[model samples]
Target chain A: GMSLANQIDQFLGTIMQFAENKHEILLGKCESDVKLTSTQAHILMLLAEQISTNAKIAEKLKISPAAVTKALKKLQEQELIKSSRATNDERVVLWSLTEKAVPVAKEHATHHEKTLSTYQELGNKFTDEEQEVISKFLSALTEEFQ
Target chain B: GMSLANQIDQFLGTIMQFAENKHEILLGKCESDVKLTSTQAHILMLLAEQISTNAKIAEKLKISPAAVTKALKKLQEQELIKSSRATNDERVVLWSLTEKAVPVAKEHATHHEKTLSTYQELGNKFTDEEQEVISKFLSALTEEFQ
Candidate 1:
């Protein structure tokens, strides 16, 4: 039998793989149906969450300014996001989702919800506490990089 | 009680988060320890895996040719990889890992091994069949993106 910590680790690994697989599938569908790369979709989702600037988005995504620039360009080309120079700082560019992006963002969110709900429907093997613990562990793992 | 499928779904979510978290941690550590960005480390690792032109690595990594060029320049500056123009085509530049990169690559590989082993230890909780199932699922998941 595995120790509790070992059990948690293995369980966490398995769950992580599944989530990634689903995310890829969801992203692929989004690209095929909506024509957005995973990064672009992510940017759209972030923009949909709130009105923000490229700098803020870059910080939130933990990606480089150049990467953000590239994604923003693609999104602009697709008309998924609109950009305007900040009045306060001409150097800063603010971004907001376009009308088309709203529906697409909602669709993406629905996809995510469906994925989670599917797990919930399958079984309640994981307790709420267990889920919380795993969430904390995942967060800690991300923090390790920081 | 949740159904088996739901249980599976949650399990997948946890695993996905774990993998994402690990990737972030690995990138952060490499950046901090080696003074290289995550993208630079990825380029070095790709180069170490095979001798290829910038175009090839860019295609494999799904990054732009320009991005590859910039990354290549930085790696060259760090003496981590050597690039030489092909005699047949001046435009074609071949790249390979340098002697200085050997130890760094080895360290990266070791780190990945340790992380995988940790997960393996955790998997001891599940039956052998369950482990095999999870492995197959993850392999399939990885293929979806590729």
Candidate 2:
């Protein structure tokens, strides 16, 4: 009778597990000598867009400066990014992606495209009314966490 | 036309955001003189059940021993747990929860119960057919990441 609810609850348990597994998948795709975290991947993409400097990256990503600095240091160690003094200001450091980062950045982009394709495929699998039900349920589920 | 897929993609983006926010909520619930992470919360509960070693916790959680060590050190710093030599083996370290961890563990359990209740409520909201649609969609969604 209430087995449907139990199944739903069981699926809910998998949400966090899915998150962890997806992160590991991302890491596997982006791994060099160093595995990448989501923050690191985003920082790489941001740097590609000419967003430089620890403070600027922190503000742009809305993460703490200390966290940004830590990720930057790891990137620097992987030789995926390099740091230099700003042209006009010796006091500020500007970070840029290195030649080594090209493959990694491409892999990250590939991961994004793969995910989009998955959504496209899934989206086509449901009818309009079914999509509405899913949309409603997910919206309500999101609200629970909020 | 493909707006349905776009909406699904938008909801997918919220998954990681939801995970982060829920973690913060858990932290808020368990905060004392120190904030707690999920690993810390679980380690606390594990200690409450008498299973008490870094190796044991690492095994039970299926996370790295290093990660368990890091969380344990933080728990020690927070005075939520204390470590001592195992009675049978001087080399093995045993961890136990402090009185301070009681409220934090209770809060973590409360969070779990609240989540379960939310599932029950949502489960009852859907008709049997709608529940079937949701279950099918979520199963497919989980498979996408896999």
**Could you tell me the lDDT of residue B134 within candidate 1?**
42
Those runs of model 1 whose alpha carbons end farther than 4 Å from true positions after fitting are A1-23, A27-32, A120-123, A127-146, B1-146
Worst 10 residues of 2 chain A by lDDT: A21-30
Instruction: Report the CAPRI category for model 1.
Output: incorrect
Writing each residue's lDDT as its tens digit, candidate 2 over B33-117 gives 4467778888887887784899899999889999999999999998999988978889988899888887776677676566667
Which 10-residue window in model 2 chain B sums to the lowest lDDT? Answer: B21-30
- The per-candidate count of clashes, in order, stands at 21, 0
TM-score of candidate 1 versus the correct structure, residues matched by position: 0.40
lDDT of 1 by residue, B16-133 (tens): 4445534222321343256665467777777778878888988987889999989889988999989888889898879988988866766676655565565555555456655444
Clashing pairs in 2: none
For model 1, report DockQ: 0.08
**What TM-score describes the B chain of model 2?**
0.71
